[PDB]
């Protein structure tokens, strides 16, 4: 039901994702925790939904559920990736969530954006990132008790090596896009060697490339008398990642956490692993790539040509 971080803190295996939950965010959060038994919520300042997450968490805790039994993650956005911007960003996140600490605070992307950056970015709008300086400030959040664990999202092997060479407190978690068709075994192996837990974002393929109607997924679902979503999520647990599926529909929220006490047989697991690693749903191109002027002229540069 949970994974153990190097700090000894536990992370629930299934959490609720909140990107694009919109005006249904607060309801979704409360349903997940109070009805469906979720103990993990994944959000971010950049999602625009943190105030609503705060309302949902507050409602969910009104019936006695303790704060210590919940695991809440937020993320530091690209515009705030400078040492002196870390704390104001965290303060606003905590205020919006109506919380006093986070369980997990993640670098959302290892790229610094100028204020008012465009999409795609104009010349000059992707700034130099002081990764070491930002991480040092984040380590101070842990020392002060404002964050129980810190980590990253959307890294490469090269960037993880850079971070591990400077970090006094290594990243607890590396949150990456993972699903059939984008396994990123390369990052998963790097994290395993460095003792970093992986959380799979977009575990269903996101909205863009949702896998619930993929024929192999459907066959396995049929064979096991489970939903396609359950198959996709159980597959991830069997690989050893946590998962943060997003839904704003009550029935899916409830279904999506029913991935315990049954298993996908090895031959079916292998067939799902066999789906080729096409391309990622979230490339980062529209955030960081300027094709005419750089410094990142193509998506492959965002991923250090490891993709
Ligand atoms: N940079 C990053 O770190 C990054 C990027 C993306 C996501 N994330 C995090 O990871 C979370 C999950 O990723 P995601 O939101 O991209 O997508 P996802 O969880 O892979 O998929 C969500 C999509 O699947 C649908 N859905 C949910 N349960 C389903 C089921 N059982 N059967 C069929 N369809 C189902 C949802 O629709 P309904 O909502 O209408 O039910 C929505 O369209 C995010 O919400 C966010 O918290 C992080």
Numbering used by the authors: 13 to 319
Provide the authors' original text about this structure.
To identify mechanistic features potentially affecting activity and roles of the ZmAKR4C13, we solved its crystal structure in two space groups at a resolution of 2.3 Å (P212121) and 1.45 Å (P21), respectively. The protein folds into a (α8/β8)-barrel with two additional α-helices (H1 and H2) packed against the α7-helix from the barrel. The residues Asp54, Tyr59, Lys87, and His120 correspond to the typical catalytic tetrad of AKRs according to structural comparison with the well characterized AKR1C9 (64). Although two and four monomers compose the asymmetric unit of the P21 and P212121 crystals, respectively, analysis of their interfaces using the PDBePISA program did not indicate formation of stable quaternary structures in solution. Two molecules of ethylene glycol were found at the substrate-binding site for ZmAKR4C13, allowing us to identify additional points of potential substrate anchoring based on hydrophobic interactions and hydrogen bonds. The first molecule occupies the same binding site as does acetate in the P212121 crystal and that of butanol in HvALR1. Replacement of a cysteine by the bulkier leucine at position 294∗ from Loop C seems to hamper the binding of C3-OH groups that are in the same orientation observed for glyceraldehyde in HsAKR1B1. Supporting this hypothesis, the orientation of the second ethylene glycol molecule bound in the ZmAKR4C13 active site displays an angular shift compared to the first one. Relative orientations of the two ethylene glycol molecules, which approximate aldose fragments, support the interpretation that Leu294∗ prevents longer C3-aldoses from adopting a conformation favorable for catalysis. Analysis of the active site, its modifications, and interaction with alternate substrates, indicates that the spatial bulk of Leu at position 294∗ of ZmAKR4C13 is instrumental to preventing aldoses with 4-C or more from serving as effective substrates under physiologically relevant conditions.
